[PDB]
Design a protein around this ligand. Structure first.
Ligand code: CLA
Ligand code: CLA
Ligand code: CLA
Ligand code: CLA
Ligand code: CLA
Ligand SMILES: CC(C)=CCC/C(C)=C/CC/C(C)=C\CC/C(C)=C/CC/C(C)=C/CC/C(C)=C/CC/C(C)=C/CC/C(C)=C/CC/C(C)=C/CC1=CC(=O)C(C)=C(C)C1=O
Ligand SMILES: CCCCCCCCCCCCCCCCCC(=O)OC[C@H](CO[C@@H]1O[C@H](CO)[C@H](O)[C@H](O)[C@H]1O)OC(=O)CCCCCCCCCCCCCCCCC
Ligand SMILES: CCCCCCCCCCCCCCCC(=O)OC[C@H](CO[C@@H]1O[C@H](CS(=O)(=O)O)[C@@H](O)[C@H](O)[C@H]1O)OC(=O)CCCCCCCCCCCCCCC
Ligand SMILES: CCCCCCCCCCCCCCCC(=O)OC[C@H](COP(=O)(O)OC[C@@H](O)CO)OC(=O)CCCCCCCCCCCCCCC
Ligand SMILES: CC1=C(/C=C/C(C)=C/C=C/C(C)=C/C=C/C=C(C)/C=C/C=C(C)/C=C/C2=C(C)CCCC2(C)C)C(C)(C)CCC1
Ligand SMILES: CCCCCCCCCCCCO[C@@H]1O[C@H](CO)[C@@H](O[C@H]2O[C@H](CO)[C@@H](O)[C@H](O)[C@H]2O)[C@H](O)[C@H]1O
Ligand SMILES: [Ca+2]
Lengths: 63, 38, 57, 31, 135, 506, 30, 39, 31, 30
């Protein structure tokens, strides 16, 4: 393994290989964020698909 | 608050209440009551 | 290497586990919808398209 | 026939390029 | 050079210009504006030779590089038609102590046609002029 | 030896050579972008931005430069049709040259990383084998992506430091690059609102910054580290292919249906504008407004911009092409030269008849003319033994308003039928079919070609996802199954499928 | 001349068939 | 810095049967798509 | 330019055929 | 399009030069 100056500067960013938090960790919060992202995707899909019509604007070339 | 927005929010609520929640409650309950014995 | 090199032309021994295939397939659908007899399976494989083409002919 | 004037180069290359790839690979097998 | 890469040469000239003002002048002042026509001769002379050595009073009269098709090309006939321009001299500064006149001009003239190889474009030229009047 | 379809697996456990092959890919992609741009500049005809815009000429990468602010050439011309603009270095040519140079630089860096593959950065300090901390890698790259997204949204698109983005009127007549303020209301989720695009990049860049910070600080849970095989780089390929085909489906869809990021002056009109008669409706409104003011038919139809009339021509719909009808749409109908004006057909009784327009689905379409209340009054019959509504029988005449034929009337049934067939395709235009030896079959626009390529690639990248996700999850059985499995896979022997600790013993 | 292209690709196919039959890898019992 | 030999290099192989299959595939693909290239 | 319509196929093949010959020979050296 | 052919053959020549210099057979004393 050849050492370089940039490698030595960047060494500690590749120094935590395989480190984990025991158990489930931040999985529940992760699921909550994923559910919110699904809801957001549903919202923008339905706006684009004209199944969700909001006030103020029309999904149209005009605006 | 357009009717389409109201129906969307209700779809979220009722999907959770009619499908996911009763399903996961039933699944958890049955998995606990019928545990595999090692 | 290619997994095909795990078979040798003329070998005595079977190159795949039909029991594992049947366990998977009989769990994919139900145990009784899966063949455990290669002879019965290879008959079905031959008969189905052959009969269908006889009908269309 | 008023064919696409690029049809001949396209057909020739479409066949010849993968052909040479295959021939190169086959002839060097065993090195 | 025009945007899009077209080169337009033209024979910028005041040859044989005769400009006249409005009747009623008693002095050369800021109001003087000479308006008239000038001749625009061909950009290329009749002695000019194109890259295949075809010309008007010199050079080949046909496409010698293609003996069988040598009389196909309308460009085998060169012409040098005499064009016309319109120039206006608007005088803006006069120095009566020395007879000098200076001003601005606007010209309108055709461009080069390449011995008739193309229709000429219309060229507009704006600039300044200076003259001295002998009294 | 390795089968031909696995030759690239030699860099699976060689981070230096993996960076090398990635740098070479990046070099080829950048070089393609530059060389494609130079080819397009070599063949682009900028002489008429109205009837020969870029999308009529097969321009594929030029619209993408224009979308983000590169609108002018060093040769003086600009895509909006303006001239005399001086864009500095960042012209179409400057951008192409930058990509070529970047391609060369990436190629040299790829060579270096290939030769000097064994850097100590790539080895695990505790052990001796090469190792990448993929979670921390993802944190750094997500943080960088967030910074770039925020900067692009907040400086480039807003015009604070940058040119802005292509914005146009709903009918594609005034397209120009302009700073766009972010729209922070619900209107930001209107796909035709460019302010929505600016707001997204500011907000998603911020959220990516925060997410990268979390991913840089918090280690993955053990459950997720084991379940997703976080120690295996093939897991990242599987999920990246998934995200990429998601994005490819999205871009194909927004290109096909129209978007603020897919303006019609750059990629051509959409098939839905033809289906719904979008431009036809707007043209009739402008004419009727002039008529209400007091103008005559010829004066009112003369107010119609030829660019607007050009959009209302089925030959410019992207749903009229062919899979092997190659090249620019000018290689089909030809280069549009001029709007011939608006035909008004009248029968001998003075009933105003309209030719029913060709729909996108039909390669051929019968010529039918209906009066105001939708009764067919004329047609071009196939069988003339029993025909009753022929133009010849019904004495149809056509008078033109605006365009080249303004103030002409045609009563010869030959020419009336010619113009009826013209009216089938929408507004009629004179074409130059000589410059390109045009064959007379419609091609599709860059809109259509982009959608096709990205929908097909997205579909194929679905297979890549399943393939690489399966390879990641089934790595221990890639070479085959265990010499056992004679007891585990049996039925009923265990309570839990596969669990050797649940044997029912019964 | 497209006829030449068509005949050439067809001939390549047929010649591949000939070589694949006449000169195949001989299956051997090992 | 030295140029060390990489140990991850593997030979590539294409047997004769694969050659024949690939050549037939290329041939028939050309047979199929030539008419569409000429159009 | 009204070039020979066969110039492009000819130039492509003139270069590519000996090129592939050379590449085939080089890649199989050492078998 | 003949311009593409000319640039391509010139590029092939220059790329061959690059590879012949950067990646040559290393002369070794034996
Ligand atoms: C106020 C803040 C704000 C605003 C105004 C916007 C505004 C926008 N966002 Mg952004 N967004 C934000 C914050 C914001 N965002 C934040 C904080 C995040 C989190 C990082 C995101 C994440 C996000 C994503 C992931 C996407 C957007 C998209 C969009 C656009 C929606 C309109 C559109 O074209 O949708 C079109 C897109 C959709 C309607 C959703 C596609 C869903 C499809 C149907 C799923 C496909 C599944 C499957 C693979 C399909 C194959 C099956 C078959 C059909 C073939 C718009 C520009 C979308 C976009 O880029 O549009 C181009 C988009 O995909 N946003
Ligand atoms: C200095 C960098 C730089 C700059 C300023 C440009 C600038 C440009 N490039 Mg070039 N390019 C570059 C580097 C660069 N390039 C490199 C390194 C490559 C090789 C990969 C290319 C390859 C390339 C091609 C192939 C093309 C361009 C094109 C263009 C033009 C249009 C860009 C465009 O539409 O982007 C569009 C970009 C996007 C839509 C990016 C989307 C990113 C996705 C949505 C994010 C994915 C999610 C993210 C990873 C995670 C979420 C994080 C979030 C929460 C924050 C523009 C002149 C185009 C052109 O006009 O050619 C002449 C074109 O076709 N470029
Ligand atoms: C997403 C990619 C993409 C897209 C959408 C476009 C789109 C376009 N290009 Mg560009 N182009 C691209 C990539 C792309 N290009 C690349 C990568 C190159 C470098 C080779 C070029 C080089 C290029 C040139 C040189 C030209 C264009 C032109 C054009 C236009 C006409 C397209 C056309 O006629 O297609 C025709 C497409 C097809 C006939 C599809 C071919 C489908 C293949 C043959 C199927 C084969 C599949 C496989 C064999 C089957 C599988 C077998 C199985 C066993 C696996 C259009 C705007 C033309 C233009 O008008 O420019 C101004 C033009 O002259 N492009
Ligand atoms: C970012 C995308 C990506 C990346 C990095 C990889 C990377 C890899 N793939 Mg995967 N794959 C992908 C997408 C991707 N794949 C997609 C989209 C599909 C579905 C088509 C697959 C299907 C797939 C299969 C079925 C297999 C792999 C395999 C492999 C490995 C060896 C590949 C090899 O040696 O090819 C060598 C390929 C050639 C020598 C010739 C390929 C010629 C192709 C057909 C035409 C050339 C394409 C053209 C030049 C470039 C256009 C690309 C661009 C437009 C997308 C490697 C880890 C193999 C593997 O897992 O091995 C263990 C394997 O068996 N991949
Ligand atoms: C046929 C579809 C299919 C299949 C079989 C798989 C299979 C797999 N995926 Mg993939 N995936 C798919 C589609 C699919 N995926 C799609 C469309 C996406 C979005 C781009 C992803 C994104 C994705 C990621 C990011 C990852 C996987 C992973 C995996 C592997 C682990 C299992 C997993 O995570 O399941 C995924 C779970 C599902 C596909 C089920 C989702 C069901 C949703 C939540 C229901 C939505 C309901 C909603 C209300 C519908 C509204 C729509 C309406 C408006 C029209 C496995 C190989 C992982 C992997 O490769 O690990 C090695 C991984 O990291 N997948
Ligand atoms: C939210 C909640 C509550 C959760 C939901 C889950 C839950 C708890 C629910 C409880 C109830 C429940 C389970 C379900 C209720 C709903 C319900 C009944 C759903 C309907 C199911 C449905 C829609 C499916 C219908 C489709 C289907 C799978 C039908 C059968 C098809 C079938 C029999 C195909 C087999 C074909 C056939 C002839 C067999 C052989 C084929 C063949 C040649 C294989 C080759 C082959 C075979 C081998 O064999 C082996 C060996 C080898 C070598 C081999 O080559
Ligand atoms: C070595 C590396 C590469 C070798 C090349 C060998 C490939 C030859 C095969 C031919 C492929 C395409 C040729 C078609 C005919 C032709 O000559 O076109 C010729 C056309 C050019 O078209 C020309 O354009 C001119 C304008 O500049 C004029 O209009 C001409 O009339 C017109 O013929 O070539 C292309 O357009 C190529 C770009 C392809 C665009 C890709 C579209 C989307 C991609 C989808 C891919 C689907 C994947 C399938 C799934 C599996
Ligand atoms: C139609 C079908 C219906 C689908 C649903 C069916 C049921 C499936 C359940 C969902 C799977 C949950 C994900 C994985 C489990 C997990 O996170 O760890 C479970 C953890 C760890 O267990 C705890 O672990 C602790 C230790 S530690 O966490 O390992 O440190 C331990 O002390 C404790 O005893 C133990 O309980 O327990 C909890 O924290 C309980 C809450 C779980 C949170 C769920 C995640 C997502 C919720 C939000 C999503 C919104 C809902 C809408 C959906 C669209
Ligand atoms: C850069 C731009 C373009 C790049 C050019 C390179 C293109 C790459 C082309 C690769 C060729 C792939 C073919 C190799 C084929 C090949 O190597 O032989 C089959 C091959 C054998 O696999 P093995 O695992 O046994 O590997 C042994 C090794 O010798 C292979 O390297 O497996 C596959 O590749 C399976 C997928 C293709 C299977 C194709 C079989 C279909 C044949 C039917 C014939 C058609 C008749 C139809 C009648 C209707
Ligand atoms: C080295 C160097 C240099 C140079 C550079 C250069 C010059 C480059 C270029 C580059 C380039 C110039 C590149 C390019 C590329 C291209 C590409 C990459 C392409 C591709 C293609 C493809 C991929 C295609 C495919 C296809 C087909 C064919 C058909 C249809 C389908 C598809 C699309 C698939 C310099 C001086 C800077 C310096 C440094 C060094
Ligand atoms: C870093 C590597 C890249 C090198 C740098 C790239 C910059 C060089 C620009 C040329 C690229 C092609 O871009 C463009 O090509 C056309 C095609 O001839 C040229 O066009 C020129 O010749 C054609 C025909 O001979 C004329 O019709 C045109 O009026 C004239 O300007 C343009 O002047 C040039 O701007
Ligand atoms: Ca009759």
């Amino acid at each position: 393994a050849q050492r370089t100056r940039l490698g030595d500067i960047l060494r500690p960013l590749n120094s935590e290989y395989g480190k984990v938090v025991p158990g489930w960790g931040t999985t529940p919060v992760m699921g909550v964020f994923m559910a919110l992202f699904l809801v957001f995707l549903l919202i923008i899909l339905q706006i684009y698909n004209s199944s969700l019509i909001l006030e103020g604007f029309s999904v149209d070339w005009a605006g | 608050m357009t009717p389409s927005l109201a129906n969307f929010l209700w779809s979220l609520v009722l999907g959770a209440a009619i499908v996911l929640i009763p399903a996961t409650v039933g699944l958890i309950f049955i998995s606990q009551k019928d545990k595999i014995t090692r | 290497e290619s997994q095909n090199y795990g078979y040798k032309f003329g070998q005595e021994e079977e190159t795949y586990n039909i029991v594992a295939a049947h366990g998977y397939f009989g769990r994919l659908i139900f145990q009784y919808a899966s063949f455990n007899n290669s002879r019965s399976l290879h008959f079905f494989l031959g008969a189905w398209p052959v009969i269908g083409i006889w009908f269309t002919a | 026939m008023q064919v696409n004037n690029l049809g001949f180069i396209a057909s020739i290359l479409f066949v010849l390029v993968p052909t040479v790839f295959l021939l190169i690979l086959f002839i060097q097998t065993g090195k | 050079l025009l945007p899009g890469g077209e080169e337009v040469p033209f024979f910028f000239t005041v040859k044989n210009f005769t400009g006249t003002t409005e009747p009623g002048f008693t002095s050369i002042n800021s109001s003087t504006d000479f308006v008239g026509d000038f001749n625009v001769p061909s950009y290329r002379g009749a002695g000019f030779l194109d890259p295949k050595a075809r010309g008007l009073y010199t050079g080949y009269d046909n496409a010698v590089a293609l003996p069988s098709a040598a009389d196909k090309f309308r460009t085998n006939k060169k012409e040098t038609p005499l064009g016309k321009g319109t120039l206006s001299l608007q005088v803006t500064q006069v120095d009566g102590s020395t007879g000098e006149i200076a001003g601005i001009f606007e010209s309108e003239q055709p461009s080069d046609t390449d011995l008739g190889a193309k229709e000429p474009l219309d060229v507009k030229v704006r600039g300044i002029f200076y003259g001295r009047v002998d009294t | 030896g390795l089968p031909w379809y696995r030759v690239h697996t030699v860099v699976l456990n060689d981070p230096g050579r993996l960076i090398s092959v990635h740098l070479m890919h990046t070099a080829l992609v950048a070089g393609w972008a530059g060389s494609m741009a130079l080819y397009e500049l070599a063949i682009f005809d900028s002489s008429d931005a109205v009837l020969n815009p870029m999308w009529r000429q097969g321009m594929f990468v030029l619209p993408f430069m224009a979308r983000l602010g590169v609108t002018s050439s060093w040769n003086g011309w600009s895509v909006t049709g303006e001239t005399g603009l001086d864009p500095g270095f960042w012209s179409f040519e400057g951008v192409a040259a930058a990509h070529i140079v970047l391609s060369g630089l990436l190629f040299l860096a790829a060579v270096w990383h290939w030769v000097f593959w064994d850097l100590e950065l790539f080895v695990d300090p505790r052990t001796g084998e090469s190792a990448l901390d993929l979670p921390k890698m993802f944190g750094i790259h997500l943080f960088l992506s967030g910074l770039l997204c925020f900067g692009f949204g907040a400086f480039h698109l807003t015009g604070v430091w940058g040119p802005g983005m292509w914005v146009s009127d709903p009918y594609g007549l005034t397209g120009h690059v302009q700073p766009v303020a972010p729209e922070w209301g619900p209107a930001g989720f209107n796909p035709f609102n460019p302010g929505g695009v600016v707001a997204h990049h500011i907000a998603a860049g911020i959220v990516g910054i925060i997410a990268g910070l979390f991913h840089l600080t918090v280690r993955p849970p053990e459950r997720l580290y084991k379940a997703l095989r976080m120690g295996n780089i093939e897991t990242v390929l599987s999920s990246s292919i998934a995200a990429v085909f998601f994005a490819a489906f999205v871009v194909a869809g927004t290109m096909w249906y129209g978007n603020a990021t897919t303006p019609i002056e750059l990629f051509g009109p959409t098939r839905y504008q033809w289906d719904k008669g979008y431009f036809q409706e707007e043209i009739q409104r402008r004419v009727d407004s002039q008529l209400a003011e007091g103008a005559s038919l010829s004066e009112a139809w003369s107010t119609i911009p030829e660019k607007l009339a050009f959009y209302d021509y089925v030959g410019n719909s992207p749903a009229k092409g062919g899979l092997f009808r190659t090249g620019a749409m000018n290689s089909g109908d030809g280069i549009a030269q001029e709007w011939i004006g608006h035909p008004i057909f009248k029968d001998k009784e003075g009933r105003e008849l309209e030719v029913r327009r060709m729909p996108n689905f039909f390669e051929t379409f019968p010529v039918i003319m209906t009066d105001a209340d939708g009764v067919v009054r004329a047609d071009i019959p196939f069988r003339r033994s029993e025909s009753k509504f022929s133009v010849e029988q019904t004495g149809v005449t056509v008078s033109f308003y605006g365009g080249a034929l303004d103030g002409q009337t045609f009563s010869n049934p030959s020419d009336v039928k010619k113009f009826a067939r013209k009216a089938q395709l929408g507004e009629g235009f004179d074409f130059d079919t000589e410059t390109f030896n045009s064959d007379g079959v419609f091609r599709t626009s860059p809109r259509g070609w982009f959608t096709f390529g990205h929908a097909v690639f997205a579909l194929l990248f679905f297979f890549g996802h399943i393939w690489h996700g399966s390879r990641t999850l089934f790595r221990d059985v890639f070479a085959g199954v265990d010499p056992g499995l004679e007891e585990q896979v049996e039925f009923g022997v265990f309570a839990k499928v596969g669990d050797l600790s649940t044997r029912k013993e019964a | 001349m497209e006829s030449v292209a068509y005949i050439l690709v067809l001939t390549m196919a047929l010649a591949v068939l000939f070589f694949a039959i006449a000169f195949r890898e001989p299956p051997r019992i090992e | 810095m030295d140029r060390n030999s990489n140990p991850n290099r593997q030979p590539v192989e294409l047997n004769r049967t694969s050659l024949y299959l690939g050549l037939l595939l290329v041939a028939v693909l050309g047979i199929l798509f030539s008419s569409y290239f000429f159009n």
